[PDB]
Design a protein around this ligand. Structure first.
Ligand SMILES: NC(=O)c1ccc[n+]([C@@H]2O[C@H](COP(=O)([O-])OP(=O)([O-])OC[C@H]3O[C@@H](n4cnc5c(N)[nH+]cnc54)[C@H](O)[C@@H]3O)[C@@H](O)[C@H]2O)c1
Ligand SMILES: NC(=O)c1ccc[n+]([C@@H]2O[C@H](COP(=O)([O-])OP(=O)([O-])OC[C@H]3O[C@@H](n4cnc5c(N)[nH+]cnc54)[C@H](O)[C@@H]3O)[C@@H](O)[C@H]2O)c1
Ligand SMILES: [Zn+2]
Ligand SMILES: [Zn+2]
Ligand SMILES: [Zn+2]
Ligand SMILES: [Zn+2]
Lengths: 374, 374
């Protein structure tokens, strides 16, 4: 009943940095060629969405944020072949065009069509599908999931199992897959190894899940909020440390705890200082450190390259290294077969209309993931 | 006969920074338990030895430098099982104790007994075997090869083929193995890939050799001294670029030349700026950059961690990642079997007494390796 028509619906519009979202009516254009219009069902609150508010992650404003979500296709534009109306789908904030040198590379996943490295806040054609108060509104990462309806490019959506619980599998659209893949795919954690995970939010808990799935013998969680430790131990941390409890810098603490440095470390916060600390705490000759956290816009870290010359490996990744469109449906299938759990990440559920309360819960330290239902 | 006796011999002593070497008589104590005294046959001049002179690489002075060499065992201390008097040997500036967590790790080579991290300038037992004019003289990296005789710990020497030409295979003690291994072992260069090599001295040429051995399709040499380009092409560079020839930063030039970034880059100079440039020029999603150059003492680089978050891998290594005592004899055997060439690295052969002339050749840009002969 809405195919080819503008849809008026509610969205959470961010007009200004460091302000609440405005829940108000927007106009969502119908999908053009190779575009998909999605009726959203559930969306998680990821710290990266908060980074848009705080100006940590710069993207043009005004904007509809949201990138961790699941929904049902309402309509498809001309030439779409990979989804149909009524399909369950997860928007892909990292696209998979299938044609660029990264998509063709066996390891690569950061498709050259992404809108993360130099955000423009548009569709692939450089235009917007959203109007609010007669004004064009930017997209976010090609997804814009804080809306009852969004429009995405076909390379930014994956069809998932029709029997999927969308209020759970939305987490496969960012925080679970990122953390789990950072451990299993990017770091390639080994059986019997010692891991250190800096930051015990939804992504860091997913890193722990991946380290435990890979057979790590020790998984040391690191957080300044000791309220995060109980859940970290539930999902596989063998011990947790709060840097504020120690006189010495935590890289020295972790090096001593691991009898000379850890095998694998993960920065899952977004601070320059913890990226350098996480590198330093991995064993100097064979350690691996993975940056997962999003750094503050345009800021450089300072480090001594002797940390690398001795033999350390330092890498980072988007979306856990997963090729998004190939991997998301498989992750959903594995979830349905109980190969991993998502409930440990979900601490709060709210209606979409209470999105600002969901951000309050994240900012207070209380929540891991709040799932918003449309 | 010399066994069990102090040897008086000629050595090149560095009394203070930024002074010529002093060629004079030293006393070399006999080897203690688990030590080996070696009559030197040939030693190369590596830029790292010049770093000791320039204060780029801090180690206690006064010192007998030299770490890239080959010679013949004169005597062994009690308990030595791996070499005998008369054996051809290469001193190992990276030891292989076989007992530490690094030696037992499949991918580690920076043995915890090394004297590079936190240089003491001694034997393993914390004492020196060298005196000159009644003063104790420091060791360098457990090797000290700028002497007619040295004493090394057993874990810092490898027995090699008795038919080895020592005036060539001394380069397996540092520069060849470092560069070749940085390509084939540390980076794991792939067939058909595009590589960029920053710095076309003895080590950078050895990186090129390894990239070509690994089947790279394109190998771009980068040097500010265009006199280095002809030899770089001879050993496998497909093209060479001088940053001084361009208005743009060379990372932009290399990204354009490689249609979006190289597969593998190598920093083989020792500058903070070129370490960051070499990282930046590798493809943002799947590129790998290896730091080989020794950085200036206590200086930090500045970089944007988004370079890593998109998917790059950054690592460094000592001695090409090779476990030194296992690898050096095999590399010599491979050289004897014509698996690689050393002559392209050798531009000058001088008597040991001409050490200062050999350093002046390096500093002027006029040599690759000078081999000093005893
Ligand atoms: N690379 C990617 O693709 C990707 C995906 C998802 C999230 N992210 C980023 O990953 C980071 C974590 O996201 P999240 O899990 O949703 O966030 P979160 O829930 O805010 O978790 C971060 C955790 O870090 C803890 N923390 C803050 N400061 C410190 C400190 N100095 N030392 C130790 N712990 C500290 C904090 O208490 C919290 O539990 C954020 O920067 C995100 O933007 C990146
Ligand atoms: N990691 C290890 O185990 C190891 C081993 C051996 C050598 N090294 C280091 O590797 C580096 C190279 O050693 P080497 O080959 O003997 O030295 P080298 O022969 O002096 O070669 C260095 C090359 O870098 C070139 N160069 C200088 N500045 C620039 C610039 N700004 N841009 C581009 N090219 C430049 C220079 O012209 C020369 O050809 C030194 O820092 C050594 O200390 C490290
Ligand atoms: Zn692509
Ligand atoms: Zn996210
Ligand atoms: Zn060892
Ligand atoms: Zn050297």
């Amino acid at each position: 009943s809405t195919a080819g028509k503008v849809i008026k619906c509610k969205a959470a519009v961010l007009w200004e940095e460091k302000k609440p979202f405005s829940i108000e009516e927007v106009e969502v254009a119908p999908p053009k060629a190779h575009e998909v219009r999605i009726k959203m069902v559930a969306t998680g609150i990821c710290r990266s969405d908060d980074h848009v508010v705080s100006g940590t992650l710069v993207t043009p404003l005004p904007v509809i944020a949201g990138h961790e979500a699941a929904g049902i296709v309402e309509s498809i534009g001309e030439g779409v072949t990979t989804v149909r109306p009524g399909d369950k789908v997860i928007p892909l904030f990292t696209p998979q065009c299938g044609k660029c040198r990264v998509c063709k590379h066996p390891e690569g996943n950061f498709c050259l069509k992404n809108d993360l490295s130099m955000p423009r806040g548009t569709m692939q054609d450089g235009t917007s599908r959203f109007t609010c108060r007669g004004k064009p509104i930017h997209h976010f990462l090609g997804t814009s999931t804080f809306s009852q309806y969004t429009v995405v490019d076909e390379i930014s959506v994956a069809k998932i199992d029709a029997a999927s619980p969308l209020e759970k599998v939305c987490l496969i659209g960012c925080g679970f897959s990122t953390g789990y893949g950072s451990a299993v795919k990017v770091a390639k954690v080994t059986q019997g190894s010692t891991c250190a995970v800096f930051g015990l939010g939804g992504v860091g808990l997913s890193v722990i899940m991946g380290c435990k799935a890979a057979g790590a013998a020790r998984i040391i969680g690191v957080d300044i909020n000791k309220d995060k430790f109980a859940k970290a131990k539930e999902v596989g941390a063998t011990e947790c440390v709060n840097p504020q409890d120690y006189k010495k810098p935590i890289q020295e603490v972790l090096t001593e705890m691991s009898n000379g440095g850890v095998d694998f470390s993960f920065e899952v916060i977004g601070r320059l200082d913890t990226m350098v600390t996480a590198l330093s705490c991995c064993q100097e000759a064979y350690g691996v450190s993975v940056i997962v956290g999003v750094p503050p816009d345009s800021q450089n870290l300072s480090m001594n390259p002797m940390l690398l010359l001795s033999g350390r490996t330092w890498k980072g990744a988007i979306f856990g290294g997963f090729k998004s469109k190939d991997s998301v449906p498989k992750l959903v299938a594995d979830f349905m077969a109980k190969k991993f759990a998502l409930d440990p990440l979900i601490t709060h559920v709210l209606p979409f209309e209470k999105i600002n309360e969901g951000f309050d819960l994240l900012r207070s330290g209380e929540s891991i993931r709040t799932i918003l239902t449309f």
